Curated annotation (Swiss-Prot):
Co-factor note (free text): Zinc. Can also use cobalt(II) with lower efficiency, but not copper(II), nickel(II) and manganese(II).
Protein name stated in the entry: Carbonic anhydrase 2
Keyword rRNA-binding: no
Result, substituting H61W: Impaired activity, rescued by 4-methylimidazole (4-MI). Impaired activity, not rescued by 4-methylimidazole (4-MI)
Comment field (misc): Target of drugs used in treatments against glaucoma disorder and breast cancer.
EC number from the UniProt entry: 4.2.1.1, 4.2.1.69
Subunit structure: Interacts with SLC4A4. Interaction with SLC4A7 regulates SLC4A7 transporter activity. Interacts with SLC26A6 isoform 4 (via C-terminus cytoplasmic domain).
Compartments it resides in: Cytoplasm; Cell membrane
Amino acid sequence: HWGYGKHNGPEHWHKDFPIAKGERQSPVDIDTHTAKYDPSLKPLSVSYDQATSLRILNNGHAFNVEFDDSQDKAVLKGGPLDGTYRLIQFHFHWGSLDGQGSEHTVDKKKYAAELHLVHWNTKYGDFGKAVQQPDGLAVLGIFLKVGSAKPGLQKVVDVLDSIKTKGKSADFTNFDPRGLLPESLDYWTYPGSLTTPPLLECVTWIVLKEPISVSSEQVLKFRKLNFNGEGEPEELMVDNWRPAQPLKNRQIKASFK
Ligand SMILES: CN(C)c1nnc([C@H](N)S(N)(=O)=O)s1
Ligand SMILES: [Zn+2]
């Protein structure tokens, strides 16, 4: 089935998922000179004080940190969004080398990695109904560059040893996602899609301008994960990013001047 290799990677996905060649696919290159400041955008509200993390899982493609989304505990509102979007999970995309790994690019620059905080619109009642709607999801994207360590990431780094292979999970309670955010909430926004199969066109993307810094030792621990299952020959989990897709009939808006 699908993956990131030569025989099952992004250039093959359209045969099972024809929407791969659709009109609102993600990620995209963000041309900073072309993006325009939008005064109609409302301030942006990240409310993560009552977040309840539960578990961390290796799915064969990336790892997910999952949250209790049975009540409004950790929500995203404001900015381009109408209504309330509940945090369900976060994950990353990363490279084999420090000069590649992000999905979005900025003036064609690739970062070492990209964090995705995935949220669903509570007017649709559950995540599976939300992904069938054009405004069903909001994904907050944050770039990672290599330099100083991120103290708030270290708890994630230290549990990766326990989920090395596809299908493994571990308890991950009391993790505070506020420790993964940069100082500034300045952002770019556009309508797009999931970046993995089934590639559904259901996402409002909100991509922060300020990257977070992580250390070379933190990213090296991501690159020790495996795509394969336990007992199978080793295929390092690296380069699990989709490249930039055609912008087509879309405008990227900026929250800042
Ligand atoms: C469960 N669903 C559909 C998804 N889980 N992670 C997904 C992606 N990896 S992204 N990048 O958020 O579209 S898509
Ligand atoms: Zn993602």
